[PDB]
Symmetry: C2
Subunit: 450 residues, 2 copies
């Protein structure tokens, strides 16, 4: 009868009248509007700082050593301002911000929106606007989760189930308004933050509301159907689907290796400054100045990565250039993200999977000419395979790539590529990167409390 | 210290090796291949019986009262075969089968694959091949979930984690191998089966493997890219997005009203036979013969519904014809599903949401000519709005409709329509239908135990 009283517990759940608090559902539309407006202002300010930087690199065009100095120095001072705001005011605004938000969903990290929200905005503005190899995905999730706490504090909402609802609403609205991906922002919460999020009928409807309001706030100011404008690539036949499983196996081995390089470079770059702010800022200007220098000479090795993925998905880079771009963008991704700059690793990971997927597709075309393959259809499957192998959230990584590229005929090749990425990353001993960063944040704050 | 002790449990959970045995993942490839093969033997056995029934109406087309007798009696004898196998050999194979698989993941229902799997197959060929208003999701999910228990019992695998993994693998594979929707099969388990499924890192990977192997087995025998071949419809502009909220608000009221009509007709049709097998079989041949009669005279009011959706989305019907189809298909959906026939309600719900959404999309083009609306974008948004209001799985129902229609420019209108459907079905006191059918089975089982 151990299942009999369990069955009587099941019938006691059906006759419950599930109430509908419309107060938290209205604030989720206030959150999602404010997240989507702060996401648009972040993207328009990062792009304005990037167009002002290349506008300074064309007025000094005939003078080449002066151009390389003002490519370094305009990106160094822009990065030094971002490192200074994090180190002086909000140290939890360094890095991505997803481990700070999913640590807040466990009631383990504080949400200091009076400090993080001006520092993650303006410090990430000069960091990403300076041309560093960092994405706006992580900043927008942390700006979103801090806006949802701000709305909870301004309107004085009490209760701990409303606190986790509005914090997850803005993190869902942050992903939905960074990438024009309303489907991935919902799957950000129920698939990637699955151990963190408390699934209530109200809390998942509020995640839907904030995602809707932040996608509408995005599309008012951006009228393109694809964030990454690759074309309409070919279908994948059934006799070519095993090549996407092999491509996932290669990504699923590299994924844990890349995660050990992220945490290993976090430790190695911390020995340079030792926690000192005036050496953390000057190391951040040397890293930020290099990526603005690399933004002029060999610009495929620097930047967030979205200006490389449509070039690499088409057959424009050779096999020797994709090897150079991959090694250089592995070095500058670890140099930017693991140094504690405000900026995520998600959009640099898309450029690393596109280049590694195009390299796989170019070998697959020359090895199998009987399949009529494309190099670009493996770049899409490789894009969400490094998020499956390192971030270890394949479903919100697949959906995000299909929404950014508008290529939904590759759903089954991406699930095949994302399975072998997740299967071999668990097998080879890999953890999620945002979990591994948060577990090192939690073990550090357990050590200063001794 | 209350959170410091919880911080210690979040650190030691992070240092664990994650224990990947490949034996249950290979068995998911065996399950997914067998589910995907049994789904195309079900889809091509139902379609063969519907071709022999239409072919019997062309041979003797000169005699019209014999033609209405042959159309009645070919479907009456076929449905009587389906109602008899349920009432004699496997009474839990009646209805959809998703409440029986959902109760099996809760360890409340037995999985008798030696009885259900021949009865759900050959009784499903009788009811669906007779032209009754019943879908093939529920049959294939229950055939799928019983294959996952059959593979567990043949290979004699031990464990309660392995039993719930392979049972949810085939239920996911049953939705992937029907409708060519691998993405909706995964979301069937982590979103619709959220209180039932025990999420593990390996139990979601085995759900991926069975979904992959069943979508491949479907696509070996089926080469259409979309099942519901509506065209490439228009995209919805931002000034028209509030009409999809009103379409969701209307569906979110009707959803609970349609749910109590399903449960009310289950009690009403049970008053006819009282559980007697002879009166249940004769009532089911009367209902099944009525839908084979209606398959010849006014064929839009019977059948599974996949023939009606491309005609309705194209704007081929009138307004009074669209009102007559909605009323008459509601009566035949309540007659077929609530009488205990092997066959689901999901694909009859897509035909009801398309017809009700087209009628909304025709009022919207009459009232707002300045919006430049197409009536078919509300047919697709309304298609998954009855799944969000009655089945109350909005993310599963959006992705399924998108994967069946290949219209992914309507992601955000379907999320707005599915939000207003879910929010108004919870506000007006509606439950999920499969959770309400199972709970009426579980409360009936407690009543047998006095
Ligand atoms: Cl970080
Ligand atoms: Cl990022
Ligand atoms: Cl990130
Ligand atoms: Cl049922
Ligand atoms: Cl169905
Ligand atoms: Cl069903």
């Amino acid at each position: 009868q151990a299942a009999r009283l369990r069955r009587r517990q099941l019938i006691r759940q059906c006759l419950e009248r599930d109430k509908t608090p419309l107060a938290i559902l209205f604030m989720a539309a206030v959150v999602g509007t404010l997240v989507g407006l702060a996401a648009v202002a972040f993207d328009k300010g990062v792009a304005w700082l990037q167009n002002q930087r290349m506008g300074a690199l064309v007025h000094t065009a005939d003078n080449y050593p002066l151009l390389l100095t003002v490519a370094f120095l305009a990106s160094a001072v822009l990065a030094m301002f971002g490192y200074f705001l994090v180190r002086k005011y909000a140290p939890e605004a360094g890095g991505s911000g997803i481990p700070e938000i999913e640590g807040a969903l466990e009631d383990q990290r504080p949400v200091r929106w009076w400090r993080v929200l001006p520092v993650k905005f303006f410090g990430g503005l000069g960091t990403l606007g300076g041309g560093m190899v960092l994405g706006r995905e992580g900043p927008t999730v942390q700006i979103g989760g801090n806006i949802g706490r701000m709305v909870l504090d301004i309107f004085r909402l009490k209760g701990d189930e409303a606190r986790h609802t509005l914090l997850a609403t803005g993190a869902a609205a942050g992903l939905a308004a960074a990438f024009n991906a309303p489907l991935a922002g919902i799957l950000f919460i129920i698939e990637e933050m699955r151990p963190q999020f408390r699934y209530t009928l109200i809390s998942i409807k509020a995640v839907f509301i904030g995602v809707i309001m932040s996608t509408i706030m995005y599309r008012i100011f951006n009228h393109e159907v694809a964030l990454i404008d690759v074309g309409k690539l070919s279908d994948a036949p059934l006799n070519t689907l095993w090549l996407y499983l092999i491509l996932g196996i290669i990504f699923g081995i590299f994924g844990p290796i890349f995660n050990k390089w992220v945490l290993g470079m976090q430790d190695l770059l911390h020995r340079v400054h030792g926690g000192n702010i005036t050496k953390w800022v000057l190391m951040g200007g040397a890293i930020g100045g290099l990526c603005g220098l690399l933004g002029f000479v060999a610009p495929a090795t620097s930047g967030g990565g979205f200006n490389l993925i449509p070039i690499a998905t088409a057959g424009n880079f050779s096999m020797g250039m994709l090897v150079f771009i991959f090694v250089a963008r592995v070095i500058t991704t670890l140099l930017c993200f693991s140094s504690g700059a405000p900026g995520g690793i998600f959009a640099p990971m898309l450029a690393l999977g596109t280049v590694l997927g195009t390299a796989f597709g170019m070998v697959a075309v020359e090895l199998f000419p009987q399949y009529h393959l494309e190099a670009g259809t493996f770049a899409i499957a490789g894009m969400g395979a490094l998020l499956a192998a390192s971030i270890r959230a394949p479903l919100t990584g697949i959906i995000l790539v299909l929404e950014m590229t508008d290529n939904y005929q590759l759903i089954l090749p991406m699930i095949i590529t994302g399975l072998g990425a997740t299967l071999l990353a668990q097998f080879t001993g890999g953890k999620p990167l945002y979990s591994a960063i948060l577990c090192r944040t939690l073990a550090k704050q357990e050590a200063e409390q001794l």
